[PDB]
Amino acid sequence: VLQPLLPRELPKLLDALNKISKYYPGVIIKVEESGEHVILGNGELYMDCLLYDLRASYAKIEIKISDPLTVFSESCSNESFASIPVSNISVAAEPMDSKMIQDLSRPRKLSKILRTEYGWDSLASRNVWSFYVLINDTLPDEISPELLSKYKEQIIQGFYWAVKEGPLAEEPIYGVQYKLLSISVPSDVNIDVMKSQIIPLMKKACYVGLLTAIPILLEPIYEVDITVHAPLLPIVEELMKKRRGSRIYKTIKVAGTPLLEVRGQVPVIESAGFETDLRLSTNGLGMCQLYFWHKIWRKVPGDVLDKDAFIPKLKPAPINSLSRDFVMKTRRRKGISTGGFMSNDGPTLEKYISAEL
Amino acid sequence: KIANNLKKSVVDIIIKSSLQESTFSKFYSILSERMITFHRSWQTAYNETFEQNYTQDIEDYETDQLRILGKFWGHLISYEFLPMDCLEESCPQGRIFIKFLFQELVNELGLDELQLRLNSSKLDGMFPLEGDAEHIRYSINFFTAIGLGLLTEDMRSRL
Amino acid sequence: SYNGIGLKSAKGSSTSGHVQRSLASNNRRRPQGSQQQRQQRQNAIKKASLAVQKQIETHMEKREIEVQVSELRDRLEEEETLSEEQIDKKCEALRAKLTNEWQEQQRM
Amino acid sequence: FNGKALNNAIPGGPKFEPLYPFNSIDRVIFRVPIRSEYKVAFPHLYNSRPRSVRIPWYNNPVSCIIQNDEEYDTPALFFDPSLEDFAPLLAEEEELILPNTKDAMSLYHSPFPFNRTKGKMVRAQDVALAKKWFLQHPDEEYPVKVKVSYQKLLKNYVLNELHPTLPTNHNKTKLLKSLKNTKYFQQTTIDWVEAGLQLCRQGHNMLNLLIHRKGLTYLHLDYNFNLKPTKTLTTKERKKSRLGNSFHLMRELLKMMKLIVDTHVQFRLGNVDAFQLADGIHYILNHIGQLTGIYRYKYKVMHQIRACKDLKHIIYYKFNKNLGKGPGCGFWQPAWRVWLNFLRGTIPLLERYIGNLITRQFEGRS
Amino acid sequence: ASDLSWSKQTDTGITHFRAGMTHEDEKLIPTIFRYITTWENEFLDSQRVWAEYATKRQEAIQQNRRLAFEELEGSWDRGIPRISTLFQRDRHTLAYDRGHRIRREFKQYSLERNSPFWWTNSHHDGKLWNLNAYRTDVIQALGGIETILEHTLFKGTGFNSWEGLFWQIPNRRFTLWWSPTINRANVYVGFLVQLDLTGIFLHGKIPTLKISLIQIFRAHLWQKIHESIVFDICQILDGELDVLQIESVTKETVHPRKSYKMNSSAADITMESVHEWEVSKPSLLHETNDSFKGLITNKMWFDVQLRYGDYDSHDISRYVRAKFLDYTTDNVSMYPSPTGVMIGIDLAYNMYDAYGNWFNGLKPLIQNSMRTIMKANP
RNA sequence: UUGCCUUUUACCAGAACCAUCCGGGUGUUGUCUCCAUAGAAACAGGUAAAGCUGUAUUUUUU
RNA sequence: UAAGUGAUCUAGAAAG
Numbered sequence A: 001v002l003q004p005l006l007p008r009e010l011p012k013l014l015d016a017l018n019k020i021s022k023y024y025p026g027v028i029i030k031v032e033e034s035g036e037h038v039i040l041g042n043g044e045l046y047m048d049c050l051l052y053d054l055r056a057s058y059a060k061i062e063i064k065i066s067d068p069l070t071v072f073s074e075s076c077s078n079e080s081f082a083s084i085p086v087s088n089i090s091v092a093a094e095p096m097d098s099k100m101i102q103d104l105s106r107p108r109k110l111s112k113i114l115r116t117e118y119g120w121d122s123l124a125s126r127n128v129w130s131f132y133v134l135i136n137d138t139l140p141d142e143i144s145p146e147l148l149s150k151y152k153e154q155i156i157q158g159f160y161w162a163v164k165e166g167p168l169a170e171e172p173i174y175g176v177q178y179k180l181l182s183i184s185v186p187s188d189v190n191i192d193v194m195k196s197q198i199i200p201l202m203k204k205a206c207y208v209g210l211l212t213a214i215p216i217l218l219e220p221i222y223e224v225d226i227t228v229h230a231p232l233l234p235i236v237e238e239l240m241k242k243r244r245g246s247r248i249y250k251t252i253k254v255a256g257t258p259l260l261e262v263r264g265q266v267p268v269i270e271s272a273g274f275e276t277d278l279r280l281s282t283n284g285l286g287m288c289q290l291y292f293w294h295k296i297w298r299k300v301p302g303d304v305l306d307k308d309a310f311i312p313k314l315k316p317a318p319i320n321s322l323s324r325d326f327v328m329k330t331r332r333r334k335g336i337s338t339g340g341f342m343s344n345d346g347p348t349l350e351k352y353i354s355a356e357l
Numbered sequence B: 001k002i003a004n005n006l007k008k009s010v011v012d013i014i015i016k017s018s019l020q021e022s023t024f025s026k027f028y029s030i031l032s033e034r035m036i037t038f039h040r041s042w043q044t045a046y047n048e049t050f051e052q053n054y055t056q057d058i059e060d061y062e063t064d065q066l067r068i069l070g071k072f073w074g075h076l077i078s079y080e081f082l083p084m085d086c087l088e089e090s091c092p093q094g095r096i097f098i099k100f101l102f103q104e105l106v107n108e109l110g111l112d113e114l115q116l117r118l119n120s121s122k123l124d125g126m127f128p129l130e131g132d133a134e135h136i137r138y139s140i141n142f143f144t145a146i147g148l149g150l151l152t153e154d155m156r157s158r159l
Numbered sequence C: 001s002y003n004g005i006g007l008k009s010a011k012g013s014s015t016s017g018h019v020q021r022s023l024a025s026n027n028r029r030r031p032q033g034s035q036q037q038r039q040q041r042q043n044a045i046k047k048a049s050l051a052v053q054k055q056i057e058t059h060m061e062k063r064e065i066e067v068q069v070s071e072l073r074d075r076l077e078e079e080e081t082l083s084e085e086q087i088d089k090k091c092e093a094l095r096a097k098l099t100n101e102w103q104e105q106q107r108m
Numbered sequence D: 001f002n003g004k005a006l007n008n009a010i011p012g013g014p015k016f017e018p019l020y021p022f023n024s025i026d027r028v029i030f031r032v033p034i035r036s037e038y039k040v041a042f043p044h045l046y047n048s049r050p051r052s053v054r055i056p057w058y059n060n061p062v063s064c065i066i067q068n069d070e071e072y073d074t075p076a077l078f079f080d081p082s083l084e085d086f087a088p089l090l091a092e093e094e095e096l097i098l099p100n101t102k103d104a105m106s107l108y109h110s111p112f113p114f115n116r117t118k119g120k121m122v123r124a125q126d127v128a129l130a131k132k133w134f135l136q137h138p139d140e141e142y143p144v145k146v147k148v149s150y151q152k153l154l155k156n157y158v159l160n161e162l163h164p165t166l167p168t169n170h171n172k173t174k175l176l177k178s179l180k181n182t183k184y185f186q187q188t189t190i191d192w193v194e195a196g197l198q199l200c201r202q203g204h205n206m207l208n209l210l211i212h213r214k215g216l217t218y219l220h221l222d223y224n225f226n227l228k229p230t231k232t233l234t235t236k237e238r239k240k241s242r243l244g245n246s247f248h249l250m251r252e253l254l255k256m257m258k259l260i261v262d263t264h265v266q267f268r269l270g271n272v273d274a275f276q277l278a279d280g281i282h283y284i285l286n287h288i289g290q291l292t293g294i295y296r297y298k299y300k301v302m303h304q305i306r307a308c309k310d311l312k313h314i315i316y317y318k319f320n321k322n323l324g325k326g327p328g329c330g331f332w333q334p335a336w337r338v339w340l341n342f343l344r345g346t347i348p349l350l351e352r353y354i355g356n357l358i359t360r361q362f363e364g365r366s
Numbered sequence E: 001a002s003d004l005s006w007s008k009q010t011d012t013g014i015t016h017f018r019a020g021m022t023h024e025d026e027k028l029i030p031t032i033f034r035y036i037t038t039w040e041n042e043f044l045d046s047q048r049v050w051a052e053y054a055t056k057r058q059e060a061i062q063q064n065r066r067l068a069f070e071e072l073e074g075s076w077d078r079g080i081p082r083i084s085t086l087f088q089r090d091r092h093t094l095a096y097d098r099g100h101r102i103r104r105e106f107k108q109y110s111l112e113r114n115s116p117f118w119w120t121n122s123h124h125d126g127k128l129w130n131l132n133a134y135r136t137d138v139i140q141a142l143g144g145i146e147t148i149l150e151h152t153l154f155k156g157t158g159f160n161s162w163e164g165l166f167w168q169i170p171n172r173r174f175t176l177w178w179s180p181t182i183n184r185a186n187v188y189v190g191f192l193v194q195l196d197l198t199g200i201f202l203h204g205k206i207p208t209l210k211i212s213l214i215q216i217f218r219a220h221l222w223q224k225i226h227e228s229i230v231f232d233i234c235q236i237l238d239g240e241l242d243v244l245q246i247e248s249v250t251k252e253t254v255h256p257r258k259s260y261k262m263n264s265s266a267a268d269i270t271m272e273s274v275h276e277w278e279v280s281k282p283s284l285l286h287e288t289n290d291s292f293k294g295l296i297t298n299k300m301w302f303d304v305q306l307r308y309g310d311y312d313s314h315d316i317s318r319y320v321r322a323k324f325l326d327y328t329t330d331n332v333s334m335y336p337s338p339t340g341v342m343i344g345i346d347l348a349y350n351m352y353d354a355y356g357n358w359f360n361g362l363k364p365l366i367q368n369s370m371r372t373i374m375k376a377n378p
Numbered sequence F: 001u002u003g004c005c006u007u008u009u010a011c012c013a014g015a016a017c018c019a020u021c022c023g024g025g026u027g028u029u030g031u032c033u034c035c036a037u038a039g040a041a042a043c044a045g046g047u048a049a050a051g052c053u054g055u056a057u058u059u060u061u062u
Numbered sequence G: 001u002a003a004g005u006g007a008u009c010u011a012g013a014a015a016g
C-alpha cells in the first residue's frame, strides 16, 4: 500500500501509477477508499522492481509503504443454515466443489452436462446459474413461474459487487456457491428504482449468506521451488518449521548434481524475505523461488468472529487466533472499523435470532 | 550459563540478597518471574527453594526480613507457582510468614478471588475440612487474626 | 543499527553501543504458552455454553419438487419430447404428484 | 552501501554514521518479523523511505564440485540418474584428460588473481593479499576484538569503494620524471640498505641544517630522530623552539623509516635471522604508534594505526589457527601497504607544509 | 533498548539490552539504583511502621509509660517521615517550623547555590537514603581492598599493611597514587619517552604524572640511588673478600647516564679474581639448582638495573633476565667478561631480583644482601 | 551536519561538493641498448614442401 | 507442546 510522503505530490504518484500499470502488466492497482493506493505485485522481487521504477524514474517522490500484506479472500466452510431476507432477497450460499474450484480457475444444456461431469450436480441447479470471478444460482421455487426472477443482469452485477468487496474486510469472495431462495419485489415498481434497490440489497443478501455459511477467510499460498545442496536439506525443513503453515511436498532429487529441487508451499503471508532468509541460512547454496499460478487458496487457521481471540500486539499471533487478527487488521487497513476496538458482524434484525437462539 | 547443579544455589543467593534489603522490591520479583519463565529447571529450583524456606530456613529470620520473604513469595505465588503448600504445631515465625504471604495475596488478587483460587486447589494444611478434633479451630483462629472469611462456614460444616 | 533495534550509531552514545538480545525475550516470546493455565482456568469458568431453520426446510421441500421438475425436463429433452406440451404436461404432473405427496406430509 | 544508507548494518559487516536524521501497530500484521537482512536485499520494498540506495545483485546456485586428490571425472558428492570407414572427431587422441587438465579445471574455476594466464604487473603495494580475507566472511568464533577489527576493515573498504577518487590525467609530469629532466640529478644502482642508510644520513643532515638555520642549536637531534633540547630553555628560547606540525611530522616519518632501515641493517649486519627481521618489520608497522609519536602531530594517523591493529588481529588469528600464541609471526605486507598509502596521502601535505616552512626560513613570512 | 520504531507506537516488553557504560576487563560495578529503597516500597513500609508506632503509642497511653526508642528499634530507619524524627534532639523547637517545604522550594529564587536536595529536609524527615551500602558493595566488587592496591603505588610506599594506613596540588596526589595503572605498559598508541635522569618510561605524556615523578626524583635522586646501591654492593664485597677468593673489587666508573640509560649498560663493579672461579650457568637468585658447568671465569661483573614498574610490567625476575642476556649478546657496551651478575630493583613495587652467573657459595650472600638493602638502604 | 569537547590547531565520521597526491593505460614520435645487415626474386617445366577440388538407367552430365 | 548462536565507541600532541 502506497501513500506519497507529501500530499502535495499526490497527482504525480497517480500519473506514476498509471505509467507503472502500462509498463507492468501483472499489477492490479486498486485505489483504496482512503487514498492509500494498493499495488498487487506478483511476488517480492518483482514488486521491489516496480517500486524502484516508480520511486526513481517516474515519480521521483518519497513514499510511505505498508509491510507486504496479502490479498486475502472471504469464503465459507458449510452451507448457509438460515435464509434471512433483505429489505429497506434471501441469498443462501455453500462451498463450491474442490474439483470444480480448479475447473473454474482456468448453451445451457452443454454447461449443465459439464456441471454434471464436474460434480454430478442436479439439472435444476445446472439450469439456473450465472457465475463469475463465485456461482449465482437462481434456485427458488417461484422463479420458473415468475418473470420477476427474469432481468437478473442487474442482480448479477450486484452479485459482482459482492464478489469484489466481501463482508469481512472488502476482501474478494472465493470458492462459494450462491443459492437464491426468495426476492422481496412488490407488484408495482419502476425497474430503475427496483433494480437500484436490489443491487446493494443483493450485496447485503450475499453477506448475510456468508455470515450464516460459517464464513472463513482464505489466504493464498506460493508454490515453492528450492534447489539446495543435499547436505543442507534439514536446514530447509527447520526454516519451514520456523515459517507458518508451510508444507513440503516432494524432494525430487535433481540427477547428476547435489541439488534437491524441492517443491514446497509457503502461505503468502508467511512468505516475506523467504528467498533472502533461505540464502542466508544456506550460505548462498539455496537459490530459492516463490510463485502463484495455481491459485491454490486455503483457509487461514483459526475462526473469524471471536471477541478475545488473540494475545499479542507485537509478536506474531497464534495459529488459532490468526484469521480474526487478519480480518480485524485488514478492516482497519481498509478503514471499515471504528478506531482501535471494533468487530466484524451481522447487520440484521431479530437480535440475530438472539445469536443463533 | 549456570548448570542445573547450582540453579537452586543461585536462587537461594537471590533470596538472601532480597532479605538483606530494607523492604521487598518489585525488582527481585520480576527477576524471579523471568527466570521461572525461562526454563523448567529454574521453576524446579524456585520450588525447592520455597520448600527449604518453609521447612528449615524460615524460623531463623527476623520479622522484617521474614515479612519481606513472605511478600516475595506471595508475589510469585499469585502467578508462577501452583498453590502447593506443605504447611497446630509449627507456629514460631513460620505462621506469621504465612500471614504476610496471605496479606500479599489478598492485596494482589482480592479476597473472594483468592478464596475461589484456593478452592480450586487442594489446600490441606491451610484449609482442612475433615475436623481432626478441634484442629480446624487452630487454622480458623489464625485466619480470624487477618481479614478472612469462610472459616465460620467451615466450622458450621464441621459442627 | 540492526533489526529496528540497535542504537542509531555508537558515536554520541558515549559507549560501545553493543546490543544484546535479552533472555527475558523468551519469556515475552512464550507467556501465553507458559501462562496458558491462567486463561485456561478463566475459559473453563465460562466453558459450559427457529424461523431460519423453518425457512431452510421450506427451501429444501420446494427445492426437492423443483428437482423433480428438472428431472422431468431432463427425461423429456433427452428422450423423445421435442414439443412444449410434453414439458408443460410433465411440469403439471410433477406439481400434482409432488404437491400431493407434500400435502400428505403436511397432513402428517 | 545499502546498509550504510539505511543504518541497517548486517551484523557480520560494517556499521556507519547514519546518512540522515499509517504504518501503525493497529493496522499491520507482524507475521514475518521483518529483519534488517531483508531491508538491504530488496531495499526499495521492505525498507520504506529509501534514499541514495543501490540495487544489489541476485543469483544462480553454484555446483562447482572440487576434486580432492589422485583421480578425475567422478560423481562423488551427489546421486545418479534413474535411467564407410570413419572415426569421430579428434581421433588418435586416446587420453581424454591430460596430466594438467585436472588442475586446469580447478584453475578455470578460480578467482581473478589466478583465473587467467596473462596480465599486467601491479605494484607489490597494489596487490591486496589481505583484502580477500575480510571481504569474505569471518571464519568461526574469533574473539570479539577480532570481529570488531573485521568490521572496521569493512567500514574502511566500503568508504574507499564509495567515494571514487578519479585521478586527474592532465598532470603527467611526475616528480621523479621532472627531476630526471634536470642535470643536477644522476642515477645509480644502489643496494636498498645503502639507499636507506644514505637517506637516514641525508634526512639527519637536512633536519639539523633546518634547525641550526632557525638558530636553535640547543635542540639536539639524536641520530635516531628523537629530538630533545640540550639545555634548560629560557622562555623566549622555548617559544622559538616549538617547531610546528611540519618539521615534527617530517621527523616522525624519518623515525619510521630509520626504524625499518635499521632493522634491515641489523639483519644484514649478521645480527638477526630473516625470520627475526620479518617479525621486526611487522612489529614496527603494527606499532608505529608505539614506536614514533606520529599521531601526536597528525592525529588522523590514528586511522592508519587502527587499520594496522585490525590487520594484526586478522592476520594473527589466520596465522595462529593450530599454532599457539607468541610473537614470532612476520607477514608485514598489508600493514606495509597501509603505511604506503598513508605516505601517498601525506606527500602532498608535507610538500605544502614543509614548502611553506622552508620558504619562511628563506623568504620572510608575508 | 527496545525496537525504536515499534516502541514509539506501543510500550514493548524490553527485548534487547544495549551496553551502557562499558569497559575492557568488565568488573560488574553495582549501580546506585539498587541501594535506594524505591518509593512505593518506602510508602507501603511507611504506612506499616507509622501504624505500628500509633499502636504502640496507644499501648504506652494505656500502660502510662514513655514509649522509648529501645522498644521502637528496627523501625528507627524506616518510614516517612523517618521514625528518628520523633526522638531527635529538638522536635519541640521544630514544631513551630510550618511552611518549611515551601521555603525550601523558594530558596531557588533567592540564592546562587540552590541546594540539590531542596525537595526534602533532614531535620523534618531524616536520612531518606543510606549509601554506605553502595560504598562497601563497590569495594567488595573491585576484587576487594586487597586487589585495588595492585593498581596503586601502595607497594611503592612499603607499609607493613594497608590496614595500617588509617589512624592542581590536591589532584597531583591522586595521579601519583594510580601512577602504575595510569602509566601502563600495555597501552594503545602512546609513544614511549623517559623522564629526565630516570627509567620511568611514560607511555605517552601525562603532565601531572610527569610533574609528580620529576618532583619525586629531584636532585638526580634516581642516579643517587643507583650509585648508592653500587657502593653498598662494593662494601659488601670488601667485607666478604677473603670468603669468596676475590683479588680486587673495582668500580668501573661509567657516565652518570648509565644509572638511567636503558638501551645499553656498562658494568658498575668489575670483579678481579685470585683463582679461576667456575661460575654456574646463568640463573635467577631464588632458582636454587645452579648448574656448575666446566666453564670458568677469572673476572666477574656486577650491574644494578633500576626500574620503575607499572600495573602491567610488575614482575622483575623476567625483566632482569632479559636485561642480562640483552647487554651480554649486544655489541654496544660490552662487559669485560660475558659471564657476570645483574641486580635489578623495581622501585615502584620494592621487588628486588637478580639474574646471572654464580660463583660457588656466593648466591646466599647476594640473597641476604638484597634482603638487607631492601629492608633499609638509606 | 554530528561527536570529543569546549579556545584554536589537531581531531570523530558522515554528507555534498571539489582539489592534491601515489600510480595506470594506450597511440605516435623520438632517442638508448642488444642483435642485425639483403637492391631483386618469378616465367618453360622438374624436384620438394604449404592453401582448395576430384575420385549413365525420371530433375541437370549420357 | 516447554532455554541459553550472534551485533562491543573511544584511544594523543602543541599552543593556550
Ligand SMILES: O=P(O)(O)O[C@H]1[C@H](OP(=O)(O)O)[C@@H](OP(=O)(O)O)[C@H](OP(=O)(O)O)[C@@H](OP(=O)(O)O)[C@H]1OP(=O)(O)O
Pocket: D145, D287, D309, D316, D325, D326, D327, E186, E187
Ligand atoms: O589487542 P591489542 O591491545 O592490540 O594487543 C595485542 C593482543 O594482546 P591483548 O589481547 O592482551 O590486548 C595480542 O594478544 P592475542 O589477542 O593475540 O592473544 C598480542 O598478540 P600475540 O598474542 O600474537 O603476541 C599483541 O602482542 P604483540 O604486539 O607482541 O603481537 C598485542 O599487541 P600489543 O603488544 O601492542 O598490546
Ligand SMILES: [Mg+2]
Pocket: none
Ligand atoms: Mg584567546
